Amino acid sequence: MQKQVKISGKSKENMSLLKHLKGDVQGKELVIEDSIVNERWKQVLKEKIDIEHDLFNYQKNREISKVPFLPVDRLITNDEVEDILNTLTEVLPTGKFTSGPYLEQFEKVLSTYLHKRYVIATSSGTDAIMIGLLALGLNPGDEVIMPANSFSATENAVLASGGVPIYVDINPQTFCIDPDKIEEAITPYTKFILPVHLYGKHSDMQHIRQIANRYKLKVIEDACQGIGLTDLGKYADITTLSFNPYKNFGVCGKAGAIATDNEELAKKCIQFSYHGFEVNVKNKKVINFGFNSKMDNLQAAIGLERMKYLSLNNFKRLFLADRYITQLAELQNKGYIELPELSEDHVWHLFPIKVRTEDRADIMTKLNEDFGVQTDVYYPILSHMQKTPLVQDKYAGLQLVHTEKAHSQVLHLPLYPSFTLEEQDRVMEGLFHVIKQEI
């Protein structure tokens, strides 16, 4: 009796798929979930697959002299462009670019994909967080517990709506908020915990929800880099997503989403997202104010096209990350670097290794100068280290030991779905070469 292998495109299921697509028999046991996110799989999976050749067109003998970290022209493929041009041919003459039926359809599709009853699509991930906090009842002075290593948009969303960030240390291996440091930071002004699934890695949400239940806190998660994570939002009151062009799934402009199972909360999000108006009643305010922060109908139509590539693209990211972890194994075994763990709760938006603090600048310089290999560090400045009057006045004396140590060690290697395996070879070879010459 054969166990079926459900292809949802989610992170846990992709992990089994990786094993099966590596093997010789790829038959009826592989069942493609009837979803828009799986559309590009449908055609690919009609035949037996060799991953290297069929998904990556591996050309080991193609000479490579430069490896850009993130060439944006390669983040969108010719087939996506043709798809998008086709849909726009129909959307443009409708004259509906802000409100419209593609926006509504896009929200339903996300709702089904996320298993969340209500989805409110927004004009950015930053707006989603900001509106989410307000809809959850954030008042000026309310404290929000969060990590200090996220992109600046996370703290800005708290600050913009009047909140007070309270920074807490991360787990230095996962780069996510350490749930064992959270309870320490709770005061009578704490109302929120805002975990970030940094680089695509899922935070320890079950533990976080336990602390939150204990102290009656609300949980809003920044999953802007985590689309595709299995069980996303299971333990959160609000989930926020970004669809900016650099994400695992993005549109052609700024956009994001709020997702929730709570109807009263959803309604408030809608009200905040559109001028404080009663839902579907233009010009009639039912709350003090709101923003102009719904997603555009035009981007929604674009999103319905690009979403067709998501499951395949997340799978290719997983393959790339597995290949890094396996081929670089020796550098970790001998204790020169730390590799991320090949886990089910990661969608590989970014790929972090850790190197020695004292060597990082030189490792980066040598990869670039000697081998044309570009790497990067997301993000260069920690929240409590920003040179702002707020930080200077209120965040002096703060020490986050693990966060600061990890921040000095982390190095991101190129990884995106249209990256080639032969570029990756170059990255890995160069890494072996420069690390060995550090010793």
Q: Which parts are annotated binding residues for substrate? A: 98-99, 151, 244-246, 274, 282, 379
Q: Which of 31, 92, 381, 390 binds Cl ion (CB under 5 A)?
A: 381
Considering only CA atoms, give the Rg of the chain.
22
Least distance (Å) from its own copies to the CB of residue 317? 17
| Strand pairing class (351-354; 410-413) | antiparallel
Of 127 and 404, nearer to ligand PMP (C-beta) is 127
Fill in the DSSP letter of residue 339: P
Q: Is 195 in the site for ligand PMP (CB under 6 A)?
A: no
Q: How many C-beta atoms lie closer than 10 Å to residue 419's C-beta?
A: 22
The helix-helix angle for 78-91 and 297-306 (nearest 10°) equals: 140
Q: Which of 30, 37, 67, 119 binds Cl ion (CB under 5 A)?
A: 119
Mask of contacts with ligand PMP, 264-303, x by CB under 6 A?
----------------------------x-----------
| Strand pairing class (164-167; 218-222) | unpaired
Q: Is 352 in the site for ligand PMP (CB under 6 A)?
A: no
| Dihedral angle sign, alpha carbons of residues 383, 387, 392, 393 | negative
SS3 201: strand
Residues of this chain that interact with its own copies (CB under 8 A) are 71-76, 78, 81, 84-85, 88-89, 92-98, 123-127, 140, 151-153, 155-156, 159-160, 162, 244-245, 251-254, 275-277, 283-292, 296-299, 379-381, 386-390
Least distance (Å) from its own copies to the CB of residue 252? 4
Asked whether the bond before 379 is cis by omega within 30 degrees of 0, the reply is yes
Of 13 and 296, nearer to its own copies (C-beta) is 296
The token pair that represents 432 in the structure block: 């072996």
Instruction: Say which entry of its own copies, ligand PMP, Cl ion, none residue 289 contacts (CB below 5 to 8 A, set by partner kind).
Output: its own copies
Count of positions on this chain that bind ligand PMP (CB under 6 A) = 16
Of 254 and 366, nearer to ligand PMP (C-beta) is 254
Q: Is 156 in the site for ligand PMP (CB under 6 A)?
A: no
Q: Is 368 in the site for ligand PMP (CB under 6 A)?
A: no
Instruction: Say which entry of its own copies, ligand PMP, Cl ion, none residue 141 contacts (CB below 5 to 8 A, set by partner kind).
Output: none
Mask of contacts with ligand PMP, 114-153, x by CB under 6 A?
----------xxx-----------------------xx-x
Of 7 and 168, nearer to ligand PMP (C-beta) is 168
Of 179 and 414, nearer to its own copies (C-beta) is 414
SS3 318: helix
Of 119 and 135, nearer to Cl ion (C-beta) is 119
Residue with tokens 């004259």, as numbered in its chain: 95
The token pair that represents 24 in the structure block: 């010789």
Residues that constitute the known binding site: 98-99, 125-126, 151, 225, 242, 244-246, 274, 282, 292, 379
Least distance (Å) from its own copies to the CB of residue 124? 5
CA distances, 163 to each of 93, 100, 191, 251, 271 (Å)? 43, 33, 10, 29, 19
CB 118 within 8 A of CB 259: yes
| Dihedral angle sign, alpha carbons of residues 50, 75, 225, 121 | negative
Q: Where are the alpha helices (DSSP H) in 258-359?
A: 263-273, 297-306, 310-327, 329-333
Least distance (Å) from ligand PMP to the CB of residue 277? 12
- Phi, psi of 391, deg, nearest 5: -60, -50
Which among 103, 122, 102 is positioned nearest to 259, based on CA atoms?
A: 122
Q: Is 196 in the site for ligand PMP (CB under 6 A)?
A: yes
Of 276 and 372, nearer to its own copies (C-beta) is 276
Of 15 and 287, nearer to its own copies (C-beta) is 287
Cβ-based neighbours of 169, under 8 Å, separated by 6 or more: 147, 177, 178, 181, 400, 401, 402, 403
Using alpha carbons only, what angle is made at residue 214 by residues 210 and 217, rounded to the nearest 5 degrees? 90
Count of positions on this chain that bind Cl ion (CB under 5 A) = 7
Instruction: Say which entry of ligand PMP, Cl ion, its own copies, none residue 118 contacts (CB below 5 to 8 A, set by partner kind).
Output: Cl ion
- Which residues of the chain form contacts with ligand PMP (CB under 6 A)? 124-126, 150-151, 153-154, 196, 222, 224-225, 242, 244, 254, 256, 292
